Design a protein around this ligand. Structure first.
Ligand code: SF4
Ligand code: SF4
Ligand code: FES
Ligand code: FES
Lengths: 632, 632
């Protein structure tokens, strides 16, 4: 059962959100390893892999390149350090784009089934978004039923994954003509998403593409296939199926788990499952079932991006971010955690085996040995959701109440700020915020996104960067676990305006919004690309000229690499708070942080310090203001 | 210029083909590093990577799993050794399938351009193959022009890469119904190739698929998308465009390079380029151009799989296999080496910079820094080929004749044994070879394929396994660098029958074929799958019941991993002569070499010794004979 913890985690400085330390210590006293303990067990981590100068692409390896110059400078094949670093980064981009593309593909399948009248458990709820998106891609809407429009749109979207021509992706019709011309001159226009992923897997194959420039340019093309198509399709279809998010209020942090209620966690990414689970479990049938089993009711909380989806659409309380999933089971009050795929730590099974908690996997692509697999499908969605919630409610009597410790800490957060909601907040036009940017009332906008990584202090960089930006009158928007961190800290509560500078304070009180805008999940970074795209278009300007920046302060996933790359390729200066494994090559490092600005108009900037990164981002914003002839 | 060689390669036992030792020593005395020297510089290679128990799939890594049990047993995410090994192998399968799929995609593009009447430099030469393949996939041929049939076929083939349904790949119509039912029960039927590659990249993403069984089953599905579709399309369309190979004779080994002729090497994989280069350079215009430049003419030789393509179709002499590419430049007589993609050592540029040799890259996916890029396209194919051959001929005067050493060693080889050619050799029916298998005149058939790897003796396992099999009356067929090795040794010369056993000797003299059948390039392993598929179907039998085996004695590429996996999945016992990086996990090792036989009917078997592997393969063949009620 219990395990010997070899190295203990100094808990008082491990995290920036209240409750994480208590639960790490509870795990220690129970002998349960978390991600921090295993990170400590991994150290020292291999320097060659950390710098990206180790390749395992063929059986003649593994090969190490010594950047000291002490030992070997070339692999068995002859690959230098530049080639190996660029290829490994290309495969990271491929994997992130692939994750987002499979997400989009599942939502496309459900949307097409609804267009044909097959999945009657799912609606076309935003017919306006459907018609406008169909018109944007060249589909006439008038004279047609909603479902026929949806059928034609679905046919085009299905084809985004594998169309055979060298014509650009259809969804690129959402990108401004300036970005279009930039990508055309650079030759990075994506053609079909799965083809881009497969071509990266081919280029990195031994003896194919050894040039860092071409490798990274195709990485740019693949990231664009992700952001402006795959993730974009995911967001647009999730809005069409479950509603475009509008501003609402909810609760954040692990204080949302209840003592006298069945606690059901929804963890993962695809809302096709989580929306059904939440609606079924907060239905009154399951409420009285839980009362029959000795509870006051059923409380469903969310974690990570599927939690963000249910938070933005239904107001479901979000319990925590990435590195907190384990900790949620260590509260001792989780009857069941329902997962689909992406960023589901396998360790959550181990942890769950020291309690009563059931780890329910539901998707054929997300298997974890030891879990209980109840496969979800669209046609019998409500029945599977009922069965799952029933299993959780029936496990409720097994909760070891003697080992329950839920941290009190709970925070209010205003979420649901899609681009449509933001434009509605401005009176239906972009003009007031544009005037605020031109005056200097708002210096700029910064999108903060990304994961958690135990190599940096938990959620510290997220919140510190957000604070330092909003205090300098910079409107902060963001997605993902950054948004979970900001919500748990209080940066999205109605009083968060207190920490903003004078101009941001005045405008947030003039529009009744917080100074930090939760724009949704990791695929909802596409929303950011729309927002900037609108701004740049309203000002007769490219995205690269906007006084704006992006940041991933604590990233860890290959999805984050794809997101940062397509931010750069979209022309936004993009900061990384975790050092990508590229420092083993000077050429690749300067391409990433320098040479690529001339090509597409954005670039990377590595800085693990949140305050330093805030100063650099603010200086870049001031530079873009000076280039725009604006006041500073 | 020259380099200090830190460790010298014992050349007298380095290889099994004559001439390799002399050229390794010439490289040493010139200070030019080959793959062997850099392999020596890499040792000791990291044990964790060698056993597959090191993962770099996220920024929380790199993570090592200690199979000793000394240190950490789980990664930061919680992934055990089984998960990490299975995921890394899945990405190898993804990369190999992707390489073969991009190859097929380029040939599909050219074939579709010819169907529309656009690339008039390319013909429909095998209209019979075109019509039969179109009928096999449900396209009626009668009443239609050749080009219209080709258009409909191309539409179906284009869709193999990205069709949106969960329906199986169309090309699976070439697989027997028994394999169909096996794959259906296992649930590994491939749907769309690029989707399979992208789904592997998604499953191996952090926190998605952690179960080794599901990971490896999707690897099986992806390998099937490669072998029975992508590689199959590549082979079928290459035959339709450039002719189905028929038996012919040619020369092998580095003795085919001439002293008084311009020497042009074609290296790579896609014949769209190499056929044009060979035809243009052996045209009389370039012959008199080379005479004007002081040479007797132009001699074009091939290396690796594109060399195998031009060898099977035109009789172009093949100069060597994988590990010999560098050595070909060290002869000092190569005016130009023309490469497209796949297994092009970047080091060949370095080596070429110590001579006059020009490394010409021609494909947008195959860039090598320092090379000269003359991009090839179908519409201006003949003009680009003329320009390239002219550059080689004009470089001829720069050959340092003082530093020229071409090994005399040259061997005759009978190549061009496609399935059609083999059936034509048997009188148009499969009955004589089936009778020979039933009698015991031929014990079985074994396909030998794969790469070269300097960790094992060069070409030694290829030739030794082929010899040990044919001496026990086992018909040896094979592709790729195994076929180059067999051709250079003499196992495909008319006298090779001398080394065969009595039954194989009698039947090869009765049909005037060698005991070793060159069936083409790495994609032409699809031919093998057809052959077995025919045999199994003629006997009313599954492929798994045939007295047959496959082997990759010296593999190194991820393409080889995909090929071996889809051989296994096709039901053939498949031997590996190089240990895959899986031994860090007992569960994955037993799935690969044991548990998977119950699922699909084949399995892996690791044995780096060629004689041991020959005995095991022969015993498995005898087992399959006993199960068939045949004599032993
Ligand atoms: S691709 Fe080259 S550098 Fe990478 S492992 Fe293979 S031989 Fe070594
Ligand atoms: S996926 Fe897991 S095992 Fe692999 S590097 Fe990431 S944290 Fe370590
Ligand atoms: S030697 Fe450490 S990542 Fe390969
Ligand atoms: S530690 Fe050697 S392959 Fe990663």
């Amino acid at each position: 059962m219990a395990e010997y913890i070899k190295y203990r985690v100094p808990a008082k400085g491990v995290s920036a959100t209240k409750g994480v330390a208590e639960l790490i210590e509870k795990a220690e006293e129970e002998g349960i390893k978390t991600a921090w303990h295993r990170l400590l067990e991994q150290q020292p981590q291999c320097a060659f892999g950390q710098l990206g100068v180790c390749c395992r692409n063929c059986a003649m390896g593994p090969c190490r390149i010594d950047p000291f110059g002490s030992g070997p400078t070339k692999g068995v094949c002859g690959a230098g350090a530049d080639t190996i670093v660029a290829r490994n980064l290309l495969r990271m981009i491929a994997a992130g784009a692939a994750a987002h593309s499979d997400h989009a593909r599942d939502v496309v399948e459900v949307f097409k089934g609804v267009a044909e009248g097959r999945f009657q458990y799912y609606k076309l709820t935003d017919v306006e978004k459907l018609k406008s998106l169909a018109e944007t891609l060249g589909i006439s809407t008038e004279g047609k039923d909603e479902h026929e429009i949806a059928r034609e749109l679905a046919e085009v979207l299905e084809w985004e994954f594998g169309k055979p021509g060298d014509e650009p992706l259809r969804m690129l019709a959402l990108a401004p003509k300036k970005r279009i011309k930039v990508w055309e001159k650079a030759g990075v226009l994506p053609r079909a998403i799965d083809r881009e992923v497969c071509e990266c897997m081919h280029r990195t194959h031994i003896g194919v593409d050894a040039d860092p420039v071409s490798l990274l340019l195709h990485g740019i093309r693949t990231s664009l296939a992700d952001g402006w198509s795959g993730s974009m399709m995911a967001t647009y279809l999730s809005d069409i199926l479950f509603g475009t998010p509008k501003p609402l209020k909810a609760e954040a942090n692990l204080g949302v788990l209840k003592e006298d209620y069945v606690n059901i966690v929804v963890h993962g990414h695809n809302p096709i499952l989580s929306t059904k689970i939440a609606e079924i479990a907060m239905s009154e049938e399951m409420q009285k079932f839980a009362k029959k089993y000795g509870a006051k009711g059923v409380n469903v909380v969310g974690m990570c991006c599927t939690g963000n989806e249910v938070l933005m659409r239904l107001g479901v309380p979000i319990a925590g971010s990435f590195l907190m999933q384990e900790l949620a089971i260590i509260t001792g009050a989780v009857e069941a955690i329902i997962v689909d795929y992406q960023c589901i730590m396998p360790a959550i099974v181990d942890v769950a085996q020291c309690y009563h908690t059931k780890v329910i996997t539901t998707e054929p692509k997300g298997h974890i040995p030891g879990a209980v697999h109840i496969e979800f499908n669209a046609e019998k969605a409500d029945e599977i959701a009922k069965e799952i919630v029933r299993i959780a409610i029936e496990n409720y009597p097994n909760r070891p109440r003697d080992r329950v410790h839920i941290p009190k800490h709970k925070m209010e957060a205003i979420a649901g700020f899609s681009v449509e909601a933001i434009v509605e907040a401005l009176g239906g036009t972009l003009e007031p915020l544009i005037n605020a940017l031109r005056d200097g009332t708002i210096k700029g906008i910064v999108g903060i996104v990304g994961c958690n990584n135990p190599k940096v202090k938990h959620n510290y960089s997220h919140v510190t960067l957000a604070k330092e930006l909003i205090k300098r009158d910079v409107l902060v928007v963001g997605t993902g676990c950054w948004s979970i961190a900001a919500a748990m800290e209080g940066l999205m509560s109605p009083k968060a305006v207190d920490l903003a500078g004078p101009g941001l304070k005045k405008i947030c009180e003039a529009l009744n919004i917080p100074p930090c805008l939760h724009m949704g999940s990791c695929v909802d970074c596409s929303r950011i690309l729309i927002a900037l795209g609108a701004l740049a278009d309203a000002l007769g300007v490219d995205i690269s000229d906007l006084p704006a920046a992006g940041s991933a302060p604590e990233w860890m996933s290959e999805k984050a690499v794809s997101i940062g790359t397509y931010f750069v390729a979209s022309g936004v200066f993009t900061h990384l708070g975790v050092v990508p494994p590229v420092m083993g090559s000077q050429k690749v490092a300067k391409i990433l942080t320098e040479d690529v600005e001339d090509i597409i108009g954005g670039k990377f900037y590595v800085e693990p310090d949140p305050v330093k990164a805030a100063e650099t981002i603010y200086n870049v914003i001031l530079e873009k203001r000076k280039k725009l002839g604006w006041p500073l």
